[PDB]
Design a protein around this ligand. Sequence first.
Ligand SMILES: CCCC(=O)N[C@H]1CCOC1=O
Ligand SMILES: CCCC(=O)N[C@H]1CCOC1=O
Lengths: 236, 236
Amino acid sequence: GFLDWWEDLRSEMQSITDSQEVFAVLEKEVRRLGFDYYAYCVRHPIPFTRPRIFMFGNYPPAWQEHYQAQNYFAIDPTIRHCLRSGNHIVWSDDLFADAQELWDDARDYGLRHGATHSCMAPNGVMGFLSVARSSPAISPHEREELRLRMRCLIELLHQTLTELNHPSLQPQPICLSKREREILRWTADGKTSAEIAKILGISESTVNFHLKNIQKKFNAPNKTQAAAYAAALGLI
Amino acid sequence: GFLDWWEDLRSEMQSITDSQEVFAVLEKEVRRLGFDYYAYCVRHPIPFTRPRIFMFGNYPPAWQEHYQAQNYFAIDPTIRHCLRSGNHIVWSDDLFADAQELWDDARDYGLRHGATHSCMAPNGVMGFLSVARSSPAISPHEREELRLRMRCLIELLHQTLTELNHPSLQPQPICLSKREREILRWTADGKTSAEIAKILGISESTVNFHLKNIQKKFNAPNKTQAAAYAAALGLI
Ligand SMILES: CCCC(=O)N[C@H]1CCOC1=O
Ligand SMILES: CCCC(=O)N[C@H]1CCOC1=O
Protein backbone atom coordinates (compact mmCIF):
# COMPACT_ATOMS: atom_id res chain seq x y z
CA GLY A 1 0.00 0.00 0.00
CA PHE A 2 1.39 3.35 1.10
CA LEU A 3 4.45 1.86 2.81
CA ASP A 4 5.13 -0.18 -0.34
CA TRP A 5 4.74 2.83 -2.65
CA TRP A 6 7.17 5.01 -0.72
CA GLU A 7 9.74 2.22 -0.33
CA ASP A 8 10.06 1.47 -4.04
CA LEU A 9 10.07 5.17 -4.91
CA ARG A 10 12.90 5.94 -2.48
CA SER A 11 14.87 3.14 -4.16
CA GLU A 12 14.52 4.56 -7.67
CA MET A 13 15.70 8.03 -6.66
CA GLN A 14 18.66 6.79 -4.60
CA SER A 15 19.66 4.66 -7.62
CA ILE A 16 19.78 7.22 -10.45
CA THR A 17 22.49 9.80 -11.17
CA ASP A 18 21.07 12.12 -13.88
CA SER A 19 18.54 14.94 -13.87
CA GLN A 20 16.61 13.48 -16.81
CA GLU A 21 16.10 10.24 -14.86
CA VAL A 22 14.50 12.27 -12.07
CA PHE A 23 11.94 13.88 -14.37
CA ALA A 24 11.19 10.55 -16.06
CA VAL A 25 10.45 8.78 -12.77
CA LEU A 26 8.17 11.63 -11.70
CA GLU A 27 6.15 11.65 -14.93
CA LYS A 28 5.60 7.92 -14.41
CA GLU A 29 4.36 8.41 -10.85
CA VAL A 30 2.05 11.28 -11.84
CA ARG A 31 0.51 9.02 -14.47
CA ARG A 32 -0.01 6.48 -11.68
CA LEU A 33 -1.49 9.28 -9.55
CA GLY A 34 -4.33 9.45 -12.09
CA PHE A 35 -3.36 12.72 -13.80
CA ASP A 36 -2.45 13.54 -17.38
CA TYR A 37 0.38 16.05 -16.92
CA TYR A 38 2.44 17.80 -14.24
CA ALA A 39 4.65 20.86 -13.75
CA TYR A 40 7.48 21.64 -11.31
CA CYS A 41 8.45 25.27 -10.66
CA VAL A 42 11.34 26.42 -8.47
CA ARG A 43 11.59 30.13 -7.65
CA HIS A 44 14.23 31.91 -5.59
CA PRO A 45 13.84 35.05 -3.44
CA ILE A 46 16.84 36.77 -5.06
CA PRO A 47 17.12 39.10 -6.83
CA PHE A 48 14.30 41.00 -5.12
CA THR A 49 13.47 43.05 -8.23
CA ARG A 50 13.61 39.98 -10.50
CA PRO A 51 13.07 36.68 -8.65
CA ARG A 52 14.38 33.87 -10.81
CA ILE A 53 11.57 31.51 -11.85
CA PHE A 54 12.44 28.10 -13.29
CA MET A 55 10.01 25.88 -15.18
CA PHE A 56 10.08 22.10 -15.55
CA GLY A 57 7.15 19.95 -16.61
CA ASN A 58 5.37 17.93 -19.26
CA TYR A 59 2.37 20.15 -20.02
CA PRO A 60 1.27 20.07 -23.68
CA PRO A 61 3.99 21.81 -25.72
CA ALA A 62 1.37 24.18 -27.14
CA TRP A 63 0.54 25.25 -23.58
CA GLN A 64 4.10 25.42 -22.22
CA GLU A 65 4.87 27.91 -24.99
CA HIS A 66 1.61 29.80 -24.46
CA TYR A 67 2.25 30.05 -20.71
CA GLN A 68 5.64 31.69 -21.40
CA ALA A 69 4.68 34.17 -24.12
CA GLN A 70 1.50 35.32 -22.35
CA ASN A 71 3.55 36.10 -19.21
CA TYR A 72 1.14 33.95 -17.21
CA PHE A 73 3.85 33.19 -14.62
CA ALA A 74 3.40 36.75 -13.28
CA ILE A 75 -0.36 36.58 -12.62
CA ASP A 76 -0.61 32.89 -11.69
CA PRO A 77 -2.03 32.18 -8.20
CA THR A 78 -0.66 28.62 -8.22
CA ILE A 79 2.91 29.99 -8.30
CA ARG A 80 2.48 32.57 -5.56
CA HIS A 81 4.63 33.02 -2.46
CA CYS A 82 1.56 33.62 -0.30
CA LEU A 83 0.84 31.24 2.57
CA ARG A 84 -1.44 28.33 1.61
CA SER A 85 -3.50 26.35 4.12
CA GLY A 86 -1.45 23.18 4.50
CA ASN A 87 0.66 24.19 1.47
CA HIS A 88 -1.98 22.35 -0.61
CA ILE A 89 -4.69 23.82 -2.83
CA VAL A 90 -7.05 22.48 -5.51
CA TRP A 91 -7.85 24.32 -8.73
CA SER A 92 -11.06 26.30 -8.26
CA ASP A 93 -12.80 28.64 -10.68
CA ASP A 94 -12.78 31.39 -8.04
CA LEU A 95 -9.08 30.82 -7.33
CA PHE A 96 -8.30 32.64 -10.58
CA ALA A 97 -10.42 35.75 -10.00
CA ASP A 98 -7.60 38.25 -10.56
CA ALA A 99 -6.39 36.01 -13.42
CA GLN A 100 -9.53 35.14 -15.39
CA GLU A 101 -7.58 35.15 -18.67
CA LEU A 102 -5.13 32.49 -17.48
CA TRP A 103 -7.78 30.11 -16.14
CA ASP A 104 -10.02 30.54 -19.18
CA ASP A 105 -7.20 29.61 -21.57
CA ALA A 106 -6.12 26.59 -19.51
CA ARG A 107 -9.57 24.99 -19.65
CA ASP A 108 -9.69 24.75 -23.46
CA TYR A 109 -6.16 23.28 -23.44
CA GLY A 110 -7.23 20.23 -21.43
CA LEU A 111 -6.23 21.46 -17.96
CA ARG A 112 -9.55 21.48 -16.10
CA HIS A 113 -8.75 19.77 -12.77
CA GLY A 114 -5.60 19.56 -10.69
CA ALA A 115 -3.80 20.61 -7.53
CA THR A 116 -0.58 22.31 -6.44
CA HIS A 117 1.56 21.52 -3.38
CA SER A 118 4.29 23.96 -2.34
CA CYS A 119 7.35 22.95 -0.33
CA MET A 120 9.97 25.36 1.02
CA ALA A 121 13.67 24.64 1.49
CA PRO A 122 15.66 26.64 4.07
CA ASN A 123 17.76 28.37 1.36
CA GLY A 124 15.06 30.66 -0.02
CA VAL A 125 14.12 27.95 -2.49
CA MET A 126 10.36 27.42 -2.72
CA GLY A 127 9.18 24.57 -4.95
CA PHE A 128 5.79 24.25 -6.64
CA LEU A 129 4.57 20.86 -7.89
CA SER A 130 1.43 20.92 -10.05
CA VAL A 131 -0.58 18.03 -11.46
CA ALA A 132 -3.36 18.48 -14.00
CA ARG A 133 -5.93 16.53 -15.98
CA SER A 134 -9.16 17.21 -17.85
CA SER A 135 -11.68 14.35 -17.54
CA PRO A 136 -11.67 13.35 -13.85
CA ALA A 137 -12.56 15.65 -10.97
CA ILE A 138 -10.80 15.63 -7.60
CA SER A 139 -13.05 13.34 -5.58
CA PRO A 140 -13.18 14.29 -1.86
CA HIS A 141 -12.12 10.80 -0.76
CA GLU A 142 -9.13 11.33 -3.07
CA ARG A 143 -8.41 14.84 -1.73
CA GLU A 144 -6.69 13.72 1.47
CA GLU A 145 -4.82 10.85 -0.19
CA LEU A 146 -3.61 13.23 -2.93
CA ARG A 147 -2.01 15.69 -0.49
CA LEU A 148 -0.02 12.98 1.28
CA ARG A 149 1.35 11.50 -1.95
CA MET A 150 2.27 14.88 -3.44
CA ARG A 151 4.08 15.94 -0.27
CA CYS A 152 6.06 12.73 -0.76
CA LEU A 153 6.85 13.58 -4.39
CA ILE A 154 8.00 17.16 -3.82
CA GLU A 155 9.95 16.20 -0.69
CA LEU A 156 11.79 13.49 -2.64
CA LEU A 157 12.18 15.78 -5.65
CA HIS A 158 13.88 18.39 -3.46
CA GLN A 159 16.03 15.65 -1.93
CA THR A 160 17.28 14.10 -5.17
CA LEU A 161 17.94 17.36 -7.05
CA THR A 162 19.88 18.98 -4.21
CA GLU A 163 21.73 15.68 -3.73
CA LEU A 164 22.57 15.76 -7.45
CA ASN A 165 23.42 19.49 -7.35
CA HIS A 166 21.15 20.67 -10.15
CA PRO A 167 21.53 24.45 -10.65
CA SER A 168 17.81 25.16 -10.12
CA LEU A 169 17.95 24.20 -6.43
CA GLN A 170 21.37 25.86 -5.88
CA PRO A 171 20.81 29.64 -5.63
CA GLN A 172 24.12 31.53 -5.87
CA PRO A 173 26.62 29.16 -4.22
CA ILE A 174 28.81 31.09 -1.78
CA CYS A 175 31.36 29.62 0.65
CA LEU A 176 31.47 31.47 3.96
CA SER A 177 34.25 31.08 6.51
CA LYS A 178 33.54 30.65 10.21
CA ARG A 179 35.10 34.08 10.76
CA GLU A 180 33.50 35.56 7.63
CA ARG A 181 30.03 34.23 8.50
CA GLU A 182 30.02 35.67 12.03
CA ILE A 183 31.19 39.09 10.79
CA LEU A 184 28.27 39.31 8.37
CA ARG A 185 25.79 38.47 11.15
CA TRP A 186 26.50 41.53 13.30
CA THR A 187 26.51 43.67 10.15
CA ALA A 188 23.12 42.18 9.26
CA ASP A 189 21.98 43.09 12.79
CA GLY A 190 22.94 46.73 12.22
CA LYS A 191 26.20 47.00 14.16
CA THR A 192 28.96 49.04 12.55
CA SER A 193 32.42 47.76 11.67
CA ALA A 194 34.03 49.79 14.45
CA GLU A 195 31.67 48.01 16.86
CA ILE A 196 32.17 44.54 15.35
CA ALA A 197 35.93 45.02 15.80
CA LYS A 198 35.49 44.61 19.56
CA ILE A 199 32.71 41.99 19.58
CA LEU A 200 35.11 39.64 17.79
CA GLY A 201 38.45 41.21 18.77
CA ILE A 202 39.82 41.38 15.22
CA SER A 203 40.34 45.14 14.82
CA GLU A 204 38.37 47.42 12.50
CA SER A 205 40.87 47.19 9.63
CA THR A 206 40.60 43.40 9.41
CA VAL A 207 36.80 43.44 9.75
CA ASN A 208 36.49 45.59 6.62
CA PHE A 209 38.80 43.21 4.75
CA HIS A 210 36.43 40.28 5.24
CA LEU A 211 33.35 42.34 4.37
CA LYS A 212 34.88 43.47 1.08
CA ASN A 213 35.94 39.87 0.45
CA ILE A 214 32.31 38.90 1.06
CA GLN A 215 31.12 41.64 -1.30
CA LYS A 216 33.33 40.09 -3.99
CA LYS A 217 31.71 36.68 -3.52
CA PHE A 218 28.18 38.13 -3.74
CA ASN A 219 28.96 40.33 -6.77
CA ALA A 220 27.88 43.02 -4.29
CA PRO A 221 29.03 46.64 -4.80
CA ASN A 222 28.23 47.46 -1.15
CA LYS A 223 27.70 45.50 2.07
CA THR A 224 23.92 46.04 2.10
CA GLN A 225 23.35 43.66 -0.81
CA ALA A 226 25.65 41.05 0.73
CA ALA A 227 23.59 41.11 3.93
CA ALA A 228 20.21 41.03 2.16
CA TYR A 229 21.15 38.14 -0.13
CA ALA A 230 22.64 36.15 2.76
CA ALA A 231 19.53 36.72 4.88
CA ALA A 232 17.16 35.49 2.16
CA LEU A 233 19.25 32.39 1.38
CA GLY A 234 19.43 31.28 5.02
CA LEU A 235 23.23 31.45 4.78
CA ILE A 236 23.30 33.37 8.06
CA GLY B 1 -2.58 1.41 7.21
CA PHE B 2 -0.60 4.65 7.21
CA LEU B 3 -3.16 6.66 5.23
CA ASP B 4 -5.74 5.55 7.80
CA TRP B 5 -3.74 6.86 10.76
CA TRP B 6 -3.05 10.17 9.01
CA GLU B 7 -6.73 10.89 8.35
CA ASP B 8 -7.55 9.90 11.93
CA LEU B 9 -4.94 12.23 13.42
CA ARG B 10 -5.99 14.88 10.89
CA SER B 11 -9.65 14.78 11.96
CA GLU B 12 -9.00 14.68 15.71
CA MET B 13 -6.66 17.66 15.29
CA GLN B 14 -9.45 19.77 13.76
CA SER B 15 -10.71 20.62 17.28
CA ILE B 16 -9.52 24.24 17.50
CA THR B 17 -10.24 25.03 21.15
CA ASP B 18 -7.01 25.53 23.10
CA SER B 19 -3.30 25.10 22.45
CA GLN B 20 -2.89 23.03 25.63
CA GLU B 21 -4.96 20.20 24.15
CA VAL B 22 -2.84 20.37 20.98
CA PHE B 23 0.45 19.74 22.79
CA ALA B 24 -1.29 16.95 24.72
CA VAL B 25 -2.41 14.88 21.73
CA LEU B 26 1.04 15.36 20.19
CA GLU B 27 2.39 13.80 23.38
CA LYS B 28 0.17 10.73 22.93
CA GLU B 29 1.36 10.38 19.33
CA VAL B 30 5.02 10.42 20.38
CA ARG B 31 4.18 7.73 22.92
CA ARG B 32 2.58 5.78 20.07
CA LEU B 33 5.86 6.32 18.20
CA GLY B 34 7.64 4.50 21.03
CA PHE B 35 9.52 7.44 22.55
CA ASP B 36 9.65 8.90 26.05
CA TYR B 37 10.30 12.64 25.51
CA TYR B 38 9.71 15.30 22.88
CA ALA B 39 10.46 18.98 22.33
CA TYR B 40 9.01 21.47 19.84
CA CYS B 41 10.87 24.67 18.97
CA VAL B 42 9.67 27.64 16.92
CA ARG B 43 12.51 29.57 15.26
CA HIS B 44 12.26 33.07 13.81
CA PRO B 45 15.02 34.20 11.42
CA ILE B 46 15.91 37.45 13.23
CA PRO B 47 17.97 38.47 15.13
CA PHE B 48 20.69 36.50 13.32
CA THR B 49 22.94 36.42 16.41
CA ARG B 50 20.13 35.42 18.82
CA PRO B 51 17.05 34.07 17.03
CA ARG B 52 13.76 34.46 18.89
CA ILE B 53 13.05 30.89 20.01
CA PHE B 54 9.86 29.69 21.69
CA MET B 55 10.24 26.45 23.64
CA PHE B 56 7.52 23.84 24.12
CA GLY B 57 7.93 20.24 25.18
CA ASN B 58 7.94 17.69 27.97
CA TYR B 59 11.71 17.51 28.46
CA PRO B 60 12.82 17.32 32.11
CA PRO B 61 12.41 20.88 33.43
CA ALA B 62 15.88 20.80 34.98
CA TRP B 63 17.24 19.78 31.57
CA GLN B 64 15.35 22.49 29.68
CA GLU B 65 16.88 24.97 32.14
CA HIS B 66 20.41 23.57 31.84
CA TYR B 67 19.87 23.36 28.07
CA GLN B 68 18.91 27.06 28.09
CA ALA B 69 21.29 28.38 30.77
CA GLN B 70 24.36 27.10 28.91
CA ASN B 71 22.92 28.53 25.66
CA TYR B 72 23.20 25.18 23.87
CA PHE B 73 20.40 26.34 21.54
CA ALA B 74 23.08 28.11 19.45
CA ILE B 75 25.68 25.34 19.01
CA ASP B 76 23.55 22.19 19.06
CA PRO B 77 23.63 20.18 15.79
CA THR B 78 20.12 18.79 16.28
CA ILE B 79 18.79 22.12 14.94
CA ARG B 80 20.28 23.41 11.69
CA HIS B 81 18.64 25.67 9.09
CA CYS B 82 21.21 24.46 6.55
CA LEU B 83 22.42 21.32 4.78
CA ARG B 84 19.05 19.73 5.51
CA SER B 85 20.07 16.12 4.85
CA GLY B 86 16.57 14.93 4.01
CA ASN B 87 15.36 17.35 6.72
CA HIS B 88 15.86 14.42 9.14
CA ILE B 89 18.70 13.88 11.61
CA VAL B 90 18.64 10.55 13.46
CA TRP B 91 20.84 11.62 16.39
CA SER B 92 24.12 9.79 15.73
CA ASP B 93 26.87 9.16 18.25
CA ASP B 94 29.02 10.87 15.60
CA LEU B 95 26.63 13.76 14.86
CA PHE B 96 27.99 15.40 18.03
CA ALA B 97 31.53 15.19 16.69
CA ASP B 98 33.00 18.42 18.08
CA ALA B 99 31.75 20.65 20.89
CA GLN B 100 29.78 17.71 22.30
CA GLU B 101 29.55 19.02 25.87
CA LEU B 102 25.75 18.93 25.65
CA TRP B 103 25.91 15.29 24.51
CA ASP B 104 27.09 14.39 28.02
CA ASP B 105 24.32 16.40 29.70
CA ALA B 106 21.71 14.94 27.34
CA ARG B 107 22.53 11.29 28.05
CA ASP B 108 22.83 11.94 31.80
CA TYR B 109 19.22 13.20 31.88
CA GLY B 110 18.06 10.05 30.07
CA LEU B 111 18.16 10.97 26.35
CA ARG B 112 20.29 8.25 24.77
CA HIS B 113 18.55 7.89 21.39
CA GLY B 114 16.29 10.05 19.27
CA ALA B 115 15.71 11.99 16.07
CA THR B 116 14.79 15.51 14.97
CA HIS B 117 12.80 16.86 12.02
CA SER B 118 12.56 20.44 10.74
CA CYS B 119 10.23 22.39 8.47
CA MET B 120 10.21 25.86 6.90
CA ALA B 121 7.24 28.20 6.37
CA PRO B 122 7.05 30.71 3.47
CA ASN B 123 7.14 33.52 6.07
CA GLY B 124 10.63 32.61 7.31
CA VAL B 125 9.44 30.98 10.54
CA MET B 126 10.93 27.52 11.01
CA GLY B 127 9.80 24.73 13.34
CA PHE B 128 11.83 21.91 14.89
CA LEU B 129 10.43 18.64 16.27
CA SER B 130 12.31 16.02 18.30
CA VAL B 131 11.46 12.73 20.01
CA ALA B 132 13.71 11.09 22.59
CA ARG B 133 14.02 7.86 24.55
CA SER B 134 16.71 5.83 26.30
CA SER B 135 15.70 2.16 26.23
CA PRO B 136 16.27 0.98 22.61
CA ALA B 137 18.23 2.04 19.55
CA ILE B 138 16.68 3.10 16.25
CA SER B 139 16.43 0.35 13.64
CA PRO B 140 16.95 1.35 9.98
CA HIS B 141 13.64 -0.13 8.78
CA GLU B 142 11.65 1.78 11.40
CA ARG B 143 13.87 4.79 10.69
CA GLU B 144 12.51 5.00 7.15
CA GLU B 145 9.09 4.68 8.78
CA LEU B 146 10.05 7.47 11.20
CA ARG B 147 10.74 9.95 8.39
CA LEU B 148 7.10 9.85 7.30
CA ARG B 149 5.38 9.73 10.70
CA MET B 150 7.43 12.68 11.95
CA ARG B 151 7.24 14.82 8.80
CA CYS B 152 3.47 14.36 8.95
CA LEU B 153 3.46 15.63 12.54
CA ILE B 154 5.51 18.82 12.23
CA GLU B 155 3.60 19.52 9.01
CA LEU B 156 0.33 19.04 10.93
CA LEU B 157 1.68 21.00 13.92
CA HIS B 158 2.43 24.13 11.90
CA GLN B 159 -0.88 23.62 10.09
CA THR B 160 -2.80 23.39 13.37
CA LEU B 161 -1.08 26.23 15.24
CA THR B 162 -1.48 28.43 12.17
CA GLU B 163 -5.20 27.61 12.15
CA LEU B 164 -5.34 28.40 15.87
CA ASN B 165 -3.22 31.52 15.21
CA HIS B 166 -0.83 30.83 18.08
CA PRO B 167 1.19 33.98 18.89
CA SER B 168 4.59 32.24 18.88
CA LEU B 169 4.29 31.60 15.11
CA GLN B 170 3.91 35.33 14.33
CA PRO B 171 6.95 37.34 13.16
CA GLN B 172 7.18 41.01 14.03
CA PRO B 173 4.42 43.07 12.33
CA ILE B 174 6.86 45.30 10.44
CA CYS B 175 4.88 45.99 7.27
CA LEU B 176 6.12 48.35 4.56
CA SER B 177 4.33 50.76 2.24
CA LYS B 178 4.06 50.37 -1.53
CA ARG B 179 6.80 52.83 -2.49
CA GLU B 180 8.69 51.81 0.65
CA ARG B 181 8.78 48.30 -0.83
CA GLU B 182 10.00 49.32 -4.28
CA ILE B 183 12.80 51.34 -2.67
CA LEU B 184 13.79 48.62 -0.20
CA ARG B 185 14.04 46.08 -3.02
CA TRP B 186 16.45 48.32 -4.93
CA THR B 187 18.54 49.23 -1.88
CA ALA B 188 18.74 45.53 -1.01
CA ASP B 189 19.84 44.71 -4.57
CA GLY B 190 23.05 46.68 -4.00
CA LYS B 191 22.43 49.99 -5.75
CA THR B 192 22.79 53.34 -4.04
CA SER B 193 20.13 55.94 -3.28
CA ALA B 194 21.48 58.15 -6.07
CA GLU B 195 20.69 55.52 -8.71
CA ILE B 196 17.24 54.71 -7.33
CA ALA B 197 16.58 58.43 -7.76
CA LYS B 198 17.23 57.76 -11.46
CA ILE B 199 15.18 54.55 -11.63
CA LEU B 200 12.20 56.43 -10.24
CA GLY B 201 11.53 60.13 -10.85
CA ILE B 202 12.41 60.98 -7.27
CA SER B 203 15.10 63.06 -5.59
CA GLU B 204 18.02 61.63 -3.64
CA SER B 205 16.88 63.46 -0.50
CA THR B 206 13.47 61.79 -0.79
CA VAL B 207 15.00 58.35 -1.41
CA ASN B 208 17.16 58.66 1.71
CA PHE B 209 14.12 60.03 3.56
CA HIS B 210 12.21 56.76 3.21
CA LEU B 211 15.34 54.83 4.19
CA LYS B 212 15.16 56.69 7.51
CA ASN B 213 11.50 55.79 8.10
CA ILE B 214 12.02 52.20 6.93
CA GLN B 215 14.68 51.50 9.55
CA LYS B 216 12.64 53.37 12.17
CA LYS B 217 10.06 50.59 11.83
CA PHE B 218 12.79 47.96 12.20
CA ASN B 219 14.40 50.03 14.99
CA ALA B 220 17.62 49.66 12.96
CA PRO B 221 20.50 52.17 13.16
CA ASN B 222 21.59 51.78 9.53
CA LYS B 223 20.16 50.72 6.17
CA THR B 224 22.00 47.37 6.16
CA GLN B 225 19.94 45.82 8.96
CA ALA B 226 16.67 47.09 7.48
CA ALA B 227 17.20 45.30 4.16
CA ALA B 228 18.55 42.21 5.93
CA TYR B 229 15.58 42.04 8.31
CA ALA B 230 12.95 42.62 5.61
CA ALA B 231 14.48 39.89 3.44
CA ALA B 232 14.33 37.33 6.26
CA LEU B 233 10.65 38.13 6.86
CA GLY B 234 9.92 37.73 3.15
CA LEU B 235 8.82 41.36 2.84
CA ILE B 236 11.09 42.01 -0.16
C1 LIG C 1 2.91 25.52 -11.35
C2 LIG C 1 2.93 25.85 -12.81
C3 LIG C 1 1.84 26.83 -13.20
C4 LIG C 1 0.48 26.20 -13.35
O1 LIG C 1 0.27 25.04 -13.02
N1 LIG C 1 -0.47 26.99 -13.86
C5 LIG C 1 -1.84 26.53 -14.07
C6 LIG C 1 -2.86 27.66 -14.24
C7 LIG C 1 -3.82 27.09 -15.26
O2 LIG C 1 -3.04 26.16 -16.05
C8 LIG C 1 -1.91 25.82 -15.40
O3 LIG C 1 -1.11 25.06 -15.88
C1 LIG D 1 16.26 19.66 17.87
C2 LIG D 1 15.88 20.26 19.20
C3 LIG D 1 16.88 19.96 20.28
C4 LIG D 1 16.99 18.48 20.58
O1 LIG D 1 16.02 17.73 20.47
N1 LIG D 1 18.18 18.07 21.01
C5 LIG D 1 18.33 16.90 21.87
C6 LIG D 1 19.53 15.99 21.58
C7 LIG D 1 19.95 15.56 22.97
O2 LIG D 1 19.59 16.67 23.84
C8 LIG D 1 18.66 17.45 23.24
O3 LIG D 1 18.22 18.43 23.78
